[PDB]
Structure 1
Amino acid sequence: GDWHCDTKWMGDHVITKSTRTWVLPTYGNHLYGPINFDGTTGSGANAAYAGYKTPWGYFDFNRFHCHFSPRDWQRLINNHTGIRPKGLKIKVFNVQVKEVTTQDSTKTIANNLTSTVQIFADENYDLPYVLGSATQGTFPPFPNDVFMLPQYAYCTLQGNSGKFVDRSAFYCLEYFPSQMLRTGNNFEFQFKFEEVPFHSGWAQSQSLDRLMNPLLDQYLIGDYGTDASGNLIYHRAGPNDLNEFYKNWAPAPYECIQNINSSDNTKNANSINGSNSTNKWGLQGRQAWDAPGFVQASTYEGAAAGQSLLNGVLTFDKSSATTSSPAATAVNRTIEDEIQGTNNFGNARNNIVAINQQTKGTNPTTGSTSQFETMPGMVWSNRDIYLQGPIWAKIPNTDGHFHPSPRMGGFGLKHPPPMILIKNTPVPADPPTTFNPMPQTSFITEYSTGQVTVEMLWEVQKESSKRWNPEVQFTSNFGTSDPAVDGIPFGINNLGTYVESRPIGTRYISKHL
């Protein structure tokens, strides 16, 4: 049982290892409970839910900065055009259970060598899977930090006002087999990923309307209009008009999403209510935000500085925080312009279709559309992956799905890495000396802690490009930093806190279409 936290680059694959220290409290006083919300004191009826919270807790490693340091991430993105996960192994070890006693003001903490902790992996996916929702409680990016394991809870099928119905499910986690760990015992688990395509780690150096040889003319003839008598006129497209070429392929579908400018406030309207202006989908008589949505270009070359989309991009914290309304200086806002070749700007809404039927006496009319959905012959790119973003998501179990790439990013999986759940075994306090049939509610106060190591095998694609001129690379560029106030970017500041200075995607090397 030793420490690791290291990376090994072998050819076409790479192995990451990392070790952390976790702490597990007793949750819920060893009790289950039902939880609801009817919505009133909150947002409203769209916010209602019903479910259960459990005494158990769980591990979540599903972000990239869990497995990669910033320098390792740089080594990846400048030299490689693709990555996918292959295998996984987890080890929980060096477990300690501690008892807490409080007399008067003082508080003493003692070690208990015989008390245990329970752990199991859910290999058959029997529990509601709450990973892949991008919530808090993941391993910290900086290896020296100690973190709490979050409490496990789930939502089930609801009726009006967040009430249970006939199909609502209650799960007992003690009904699973688990193994019991003392000091000296360890838990191990291995997993193999299913086959998935490489994530595309390059930026597009062509656009989908320019794929032609610009010097030539087509052998296809286009319809230029009618003359004053109504006879069809023909025209051949060529170098003076490249936009009129007949083409084999069309760009990505869209639902129109509203623009927003993050840098410059003169471009925005005053007092926008974000919730009223976001895209939404309905289900069971209520509405939910559609965000980030299916990825669109958030900006393009020639657009104004700071151009973005309203709830169309991902935004991260610079450091772990609880704030409900963080300041603009505290966040990293992503920008996806690398897809601008196949993916239109999200607020453009500039596709045109014919809205009537023309005859002599009635002129043809057209209109722009806010909705243009999938048609045969369209191509598109997925959203990028980030050092701060999620790795995988579980594909819902359903009869049908279209292009099951998760919208926030990463790898869609039929069988994701299973949840690993853990809790302290309850230790009763002193019973009465007369028999009582009731369940015993008095327990010894305790918590546990240990180490966990995660090892991942990744497969990568090296970059072969034959362009003559140099390419854009990710580099560290800042003028100067004050060690008194600030410290080194991607480092520890003056207060001992780890700071992630800016967001980092994977798309730097370029390819033609």
Structure 2
Amino acid sequence: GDWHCDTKWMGDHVITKSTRTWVLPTYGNHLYGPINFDGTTGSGANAAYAGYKTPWGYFDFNRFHCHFSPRDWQRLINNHTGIRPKGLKIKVFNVQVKEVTTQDSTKTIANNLTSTVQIFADENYDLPYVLGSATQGTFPPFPNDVFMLPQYAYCTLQGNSGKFVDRSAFYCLEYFPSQMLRTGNNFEFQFKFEEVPFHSGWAQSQSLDRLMNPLLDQYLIGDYGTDASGNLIYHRAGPNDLNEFYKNWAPAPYECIQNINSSDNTKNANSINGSNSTNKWGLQGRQAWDAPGFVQASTYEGAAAGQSLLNGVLTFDKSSATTSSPAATAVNRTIEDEIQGTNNFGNARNNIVAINQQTKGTNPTTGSTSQFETMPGMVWSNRDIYLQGPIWAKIPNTDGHFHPSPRMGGFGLKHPPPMILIKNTPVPADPPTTFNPMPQTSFITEYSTGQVTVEMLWEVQKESSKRWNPEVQFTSNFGTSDPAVDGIPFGINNLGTYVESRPIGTRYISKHL
């Protein structure tokens, strides 16, 4: 094969080709193993797990910025109001296996021509599907970078203290038909996405509470109170009070999510514990963070600067890092302000409901609600997709699901792109000259490398806006930057590392609600 990265913009379609270079170590000395964590030490009992490690490794292209460049992304989001995937093609080729030898003086790396690697795609979704979990190991943003393929592992059911049970499964991955690749062999795979709705690539220029003609007043009469003697009073909503209007629709449901201010130091309580104050959902005797949760507006218009939600937003790294506790200057923190029309600000407990039953003696009382869930007549909007975020997720296999759109973002798929696994086939060292029945555990040290190209077909919506005035769009203004320390933003810096300077998202075009 050959190296081709590019994009081709057609009218309703766009094709993004990109190709990388990878390196595959031998994981676990060609051995499976059990893994668990009991809840006795460390984080606690909620952190327990049980599963297996596998000598295999896999490709993960799930994130968007694998397939797009900051210029191609800008071309998408200013012009087009929607996108969905159509199909993908991936090809792994130019595989070459290298053997390592050490005399303690130096390493000597040689190229073994006849050794192979094994690769297969999991067509029927027989193995546990780890791709939709937004973990690391994805292709790099920048094509000149060389990346390392992750090791495959999974969790099964667990008992108390992170132990196996009867339902726990063990999967042998050598029991799957696979293809062996030498130099001069390649692996190709075709895939076609199922029908999904376009992601809404447009911000909304109206609110639900004002859909009305503001000059008029209703023919529907309201209940304005009671008399001093107890007689009912009526009122007609009009342009003086538009909150009085009867309405057909209601905004999004919510669970109350605590607020936190990223910019302003003086808006946050001192020394809050994010583990205690985060929303949880419990299952099977233990409870896990509910994050990000169902999307709420992080901030609305006319709100404090820096307002956000605690574990309510996505946050990314400017450049790939292992830090585990990154500084505020090393991260890109997204904000959802574009859904503020249909989606109430999380941590605002506005919704009011009647808590008693009136009569002569008892005055009616109401109260604000911390959690208000779905009822007929509600409209909401999904979380935005970002250049740095996940493309898809696998809808769990279950008897029911409600609005199966992934909470982190992207496209819920029942048959997502399959998970493609690869390993270095083992080559044994010299056996003894008398037969031994035991397994032969001594192998030659080796690793693999090659290229992988990924071509993906997308479906876009181009629109016609009849608003007169111009619209906000994504522009790059940093002023000046210093080539002696940090290069062009969204470019290579002085040390050679690629830096994504700020988060980007798809909603720059306003459309009336």
TM-score bracket, shorter-length normalisation: over 0.9
CA apart distance, 1:431: 0.5
CA apart distance, 1:361: 1.1
Which whole-Å deviations, capped at 9, do the CAs of 1:1-58 have from their partners, x for residues lacking one? 1001100000000000000000000000000000000023321000000000000000
1:122 pairs with 2:122: yes
- Partner of 2:452: helix, strand, or coil? strand
Question: Is the CA contact (8 Å cut-off) linking 2:46 and 2:286 kept in structure 1?
Answer: yes
CA distance in 2, matches of 1:479, 1:412: 39
Which whole-Å deviations, capped at 9, do the CAs of 1:469-498 have from their partners, x for residues lacking one? 000010001111000011100000000000
CA distance in 1, matches of 2:342, 2:55: 48
- Partner of 2:5: helix, strand, or coil? coil
Which whole-Å deviations, capped at 9, do the CAs of 1:181-204 have from their partners, x for residues lacking one? 000000000000000000000000
Which whole-Å deviations, capped at 9, do the CAs of 1:82-129 have from their partners, x for residues lacking one? 000000111000000000000132110000000000000000000000
CA distance in 2, matches of 1:258, 1:105: 58
CA distance in 1, matches of 2:465, 2:429: 69
Alpha-carbon RMSD: 0.4
CA distance in 2, matches of 1:40, 1:102: 41
CA distance in 2, matches of 1:291, 1:40: 25
- Partner of 1:54: helix, strand, or coil? strand
CA distance in 1, matches of 2:398, 2:64: 28
CA distance in 2, matches of 1:39, 1:459: 47
CA distance in 2, matches of 1:347, 1:105: 62
CA distance in 2, matches of 1:403, 1:180: 41
CA apart distance, 1:261: 0.2
Question: Is the CA contact (8 Å cut-off) linking 2:19 and 2:452 kept in structure 1?
Answer: yes
- The residue aligned with 2:420 is 420
- The residue aligned with 1:350 is 350
CA distance in 1, matches of 2:135, 2:2: 29
CA distance in 2, matches of 1:288, 1:117: 38
CA distance in 2, matches of 1:67, 1:463: 23
CA distance in 2, matches of 1:387, 1:252: 25
- Partner of 1:222: helix, strand, or coil? strand
Percent identity over paired residues: 100
Q: Which runs of 5+ in 2 are unaligned?
A: none
CA distance in 1, matches of 2:91, 2:486: 36
Question: Is the CA contact (8 Å cut-off) linking 2:224 and 2:233 kept in structure 1?
Answer: yes
Of the structure 1 ranges 97-106 and 287-296, higher mean CA displacement relative to structure 2 is found in 97-106
Which whole-Å deviations, capped at 9, do the CAs of 1:50-81 have from their partners, x for residues lacking one? 00000000000000000000000000000000
Which whole-Å deviations, capped at 9, do the CAs of 1:222-281 have from their partners, x for residues lacking one? 000001100000000000000000000000000000000000110000000000000000
CA distance in 2, matches of 1:326, 1:101: 38
CA apart distance, 1:344: 0.1
- Partner of 1:326: helix, strand, or coil? coil
Question: Is the CA contact (8 Å cut-off) linking 2:116 and 2:425 kept in structure 1?
Answer: yes
- The residue aligned with 2:478 is 478
CA distance in 2, matches of 1:361, 1:324: 60
CA distance in 1, matches of 2:167, 2:365: 52
Question: Is the CA contact (8 Å cut-off) linking 2:158 and 2:168 kept in structure 1?
Answer: yes
CA distance in 2, matches of 1:337, 1:221: 34
Question: Is the CA contact (8 Å cut-off) linking 2:40 and 2:161 kept in structure 1?
Answer: no
- The residue aligned with 1:19 is 19
- Partner of 2:133: helix, strand, or coil? coil
Q: Which runs of 5+ in 1 are unaligned?
A: none
- Partner of 1:421: helix, strand, or coil? strand
Of the structure 1 ranges 101-110 and 448-457, higher mean CA displacement relative to structure 2 is found in 101-110
CA distance in 1, matches of 2:105, 2:493: 35
CA distance in 1, matches of 2:448, 2:512: 54
- Partner of 2:71: helix, strand, or coil? helix
- Partner of 2:275: helix, strand, or coil? helix
Relative to the length of structure 1, the TM-score reads 1.00
Task: Give the number of equivalent residue pairs.
Answer: 513
Of the structure 1 ranges 32-41 and 192-201, higher mean CA displacement relative to structure 2 is found in 32-41
CA distance in 1, matches of 2:439, 2:293: 50
CA apart distance, 1:324: 1.1
CA distance in 2, matches of 1:328, 1:442: 47
Alignment of 1:51-450 (within 5 A): 51-450=51-450
- Partner of 1:162: helix, strand, or coil? coil
CA distance in 2, matches of 1:125, 1:104: 45
CA distance in 2, matches of 1:417, 1:374: 31
CA distance in 2, matches of 1:194, 1:111: 42
CA distance in 2, matches of 1:40, 1:29: 29
Relative to the length of structure 2, the TM-score reads 1.00
CA apart distance, 1:463: 1.7
1:461 pairs with 2:461: yes
